[PDB]
């Protein structure tokens, strides 16, 4: 059952890597096997102290177990942090590695799943809560006060794995976080509203 | 080949515009539509992904061209030059009338 | 209610030194409101997390937002890449 489950990920992650060549990047052994939140600080310590991802499958480095995919996730996150720190923040091979990390992390999170407030004091008294919760990463925009116009910026394409200090082309800039809006879509109008007789 | 100035900014759309169906004479880029820079009156349902590239050999009549033809007929009620450019300008008057009949 | 307002602005000072990541005109475009971040475009219309059937206080920490977004399974994608060549 786990036989084809590596073969398909192999084929997909090969064919979705043509324009950026992430898989054929150089990568030595790098035995960490650590907490994935430590995955850059551990490689920082590996830089301070002192076989690529395609060749890992050809040598059979991954078993049909939980660790046999945890190592694959670990290797992808390492190569993506390396390729983020290697390029500047505006090049196309920065954004391709960011998109490839997003796609592959989404592909590897699923299919291993197959395999204090007065308003709350009113509502938890009045209703019954069946629920659902999840995590998303937010992003940033800039902020400027001109003469009575009070502008905004676009979304910075800085990835979630950048870790750099926040540089600013102006000190009269400000920075803000954009909370994503998410809920049951508000009932859209019918097609009689969209395209009536004018 | 025409050029499609993106509304709400000054940019040029590359090969995909987002046509609005209630002002009916505006467009957008992809990035101004991903982030929602099109004003709080519109609701991101009334924006159809239209293309800009030259299509295949003629008398195919893709659904984009049929839709823009019917948009033009609802706009102008006459004036088949102003219909044939709104289709895209790569079709003649004498073929738009032969296709609407 | 007008339509033809400008709603984008450009400052005169060329600060184009550390700005290759933002949206440039080709300067820097400065809009009159923020952006809108949308998690997933396609709603998953069934799924009793969302449909709420009328039969039978509980919490559930689902993995990611990707449950609510119609993702294809990988065996079809490998089948289609095999059909590619």
């Amino acid at each position: 059952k786990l036989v084809d489950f590596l073969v398909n990920v192999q084929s997909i992650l090969n064919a979705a890597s043509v324009k950026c060549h992430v898989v054929d990047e150089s990568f030595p052994a790098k035995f960490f096997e650590k907490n994935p939140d430590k995955i850059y600080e551990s490689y920082c310590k590996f830089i301070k102290n002192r076989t690529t991802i395609n060749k890992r499958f050809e040598n059979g480095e991954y078993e049909p177990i939980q660790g046999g995919f945890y190592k694959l996730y670990h290797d992808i996150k390492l190569v993506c942090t390396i390729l983020i720190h290697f390029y500047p923040q505006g090049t196309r091979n920065y954004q391709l590695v960011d998109k490839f990390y997003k796609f592959s992390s989404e592909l590897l999170l699923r299919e291993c799943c197959r395999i204090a407030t007065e308003l709350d004091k009113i509502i938890s008294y009045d209703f019954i809560k069946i629920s659902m919760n999840y995590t998303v990463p937010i992003s940033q925009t800039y902020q400027i006060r001109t003469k009575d116009m009070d502008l905004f910026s676009s979304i910075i394409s800085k990835s979630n794995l950048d870790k750099r200090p926040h540089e600013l082309p102006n000190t009269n800039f400000k920075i803000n976080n954009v909370l994503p809006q998410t809920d049951i879509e508000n009932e859209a109008p019918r097609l009689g509203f969209v395209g009536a007789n004018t | 080949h025409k050029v499609y100035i993106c509304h709400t900014c000054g940019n040029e759309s590359i090969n995909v515009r987002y046509h609005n169906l209630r002002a009916r004479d505006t467009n957008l880029c992809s990035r101004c539509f991903q982030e929602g820079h099109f004003g709080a009156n519109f609701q991101s349902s009334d924006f159809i992904r239209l293309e800009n590239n030259g299509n295949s050999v003629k008398k195919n009549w893709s659904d984009q061209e049929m839709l823009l033809l019917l948009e033009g007929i609802e706009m102008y009620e006459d004036q088949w030059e102003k219909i044939a450019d709104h289709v895209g300008g790569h079709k003649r008057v004498e073929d738009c009338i032969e296709k609407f009949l | 209610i007008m339509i033809d307002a400008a709603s984008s602005f450009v400052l005169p000072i060329s600060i184009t030194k550390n700005v290759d990541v933002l949206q440039r005109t080709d300067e820097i475009l400065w809009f009159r409101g923020p952006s809108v971040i949308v998690n997933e475009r396609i709603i998953n219309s069934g799924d009793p997390h969302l449909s709420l059937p009328l039969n039978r206080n509980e919490k559930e920490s689902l993995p990611g937002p990707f449950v609510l977004g119609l993702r294809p399974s990988a065996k079809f994608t490998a089948h289609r890449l095999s059909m590619l060549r």
Partner: peptide, 29 residues
């Protein structure tokens, strides 16, 4: 910096819709 009135980019609706991209039709010398 707070006295730095910004420049509006006007769209001019007829430019946004259908602008094409005259001696190159040889009938006019």
């Amino acid at each position: 910096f707070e006295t730095m009135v910004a420049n509006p980019i006007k769209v001019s609706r007829l430019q946004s819709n259908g602008v094409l991209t005259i001696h190159y039709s040889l009938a006019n010398f």
